[PDB]
Design a protein around this ligand. Structure first.
Ligand SMILES: CCCCCc1ccc(-c2ccc(S(=O)(=O)CCO)cc2)cc1[C@H]1C[C@H]1c1ccccn1
Length: 230
């Protein structure tokens, strides 16, 4: 029990309530890019001329579990292996074995100024609602304030609320051949400051599918031929 346990519970529960709902019957979501089971949706939203466009994606990854996907998403020691848009990151505070506060800077995308972020990152297991249902693994990354925040005069401070939500199906020794992880990934980013709307939309449209294809392939790569961590 650290000082964020209640805020964590609330963000996690809001994701479980709202973020998992199916979009596809929902015309409010624009399906922007499909590549197989990878589907990436946005809503076009701006506040005081700043693009906020909610991002929502689903995916189905053969051969890995939700537990594994989330550990790898969460574990700072493998970040450099799959991240391509980060210039620097620092762990600012360890809250618990499942929660940390991270400071990170993103590579500049010309001509906007550089962005930095300060966020709590927590990984959690949500037991099945009934023995009929899937257990779920979630990572939530959401912006928080911290006294130890770096001074970075190059950077505008972005605010994020991101969740990677994972459910695992097995069609039955259980083999990697028989496992499928369904991912829901949501990212609500306020970039701060101003940035050209066209720049923000082009960076999102390029970087989110790249990230999901890349990150998920990395998890397949690292886990293959290892005992399955359900
Ligand atoms: C002018 C450029 C403004 C940059 C705005 C910005 C900041 C953070 C982020 C972001 C922050 C966290 C995550 S994560 O999934 O929690 C993993 C850990 O890093 C993911 C994306 C995104 C964007 C928006 C560009 C969009 C974009 C999308 C994928 C990569 C880079 N940029």
């Amino acid at each position: 029990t650290h000082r964020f346990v209640q805020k964590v519970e609330e963000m996690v529960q809001n994701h479980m309530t709202y973020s998992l709902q199916d979009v596809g019957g929902d015309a409010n979501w624009q399906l922007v890019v499909e590549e197989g089971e990878m589907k990436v949706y946005r809503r076009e939203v701006e506040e005081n001329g700043i693009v906020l466009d909610p991002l929502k994606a689903t995916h189905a990854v053969k051969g890995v579990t939700g537990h594994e996907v989330c550990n790898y998403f969460w574990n700072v020691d493998v970040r450099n292996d799959w991240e391509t848009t980060i210039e620097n990151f620092h762990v600012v505070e360890t809250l618990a074995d499942n929660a940390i506060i991270i400071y990170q800077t993103h590579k500049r995308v010309w001509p906007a100024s550089q962005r930095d972020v300060l966020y709590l990152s927590v990984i959690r297991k949500i037991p099945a609602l009934t023995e009929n249902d899937p257990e779920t693994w979630i990572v939530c990354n959401f912006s928080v304030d911290h006294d130890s925040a770096p001074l970075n005069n190059r950077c505008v401070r972005a605010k994020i609320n991101v969740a990677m939500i994972c459910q695992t199906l097995v069609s039955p020794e259980i083999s990697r051949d028989n496992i499928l992880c369904k991912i829901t990934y949501v990212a609500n980013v306020n970039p701060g400051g101003w940035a050209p709307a066209s720049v923000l939309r082009a960076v999102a449209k390029r970087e989110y599918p790249k990230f999901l294809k890349r990150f998920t392939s990395y998890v397949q790569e690292k886990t293959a031929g290892k005992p399955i961590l359900f």
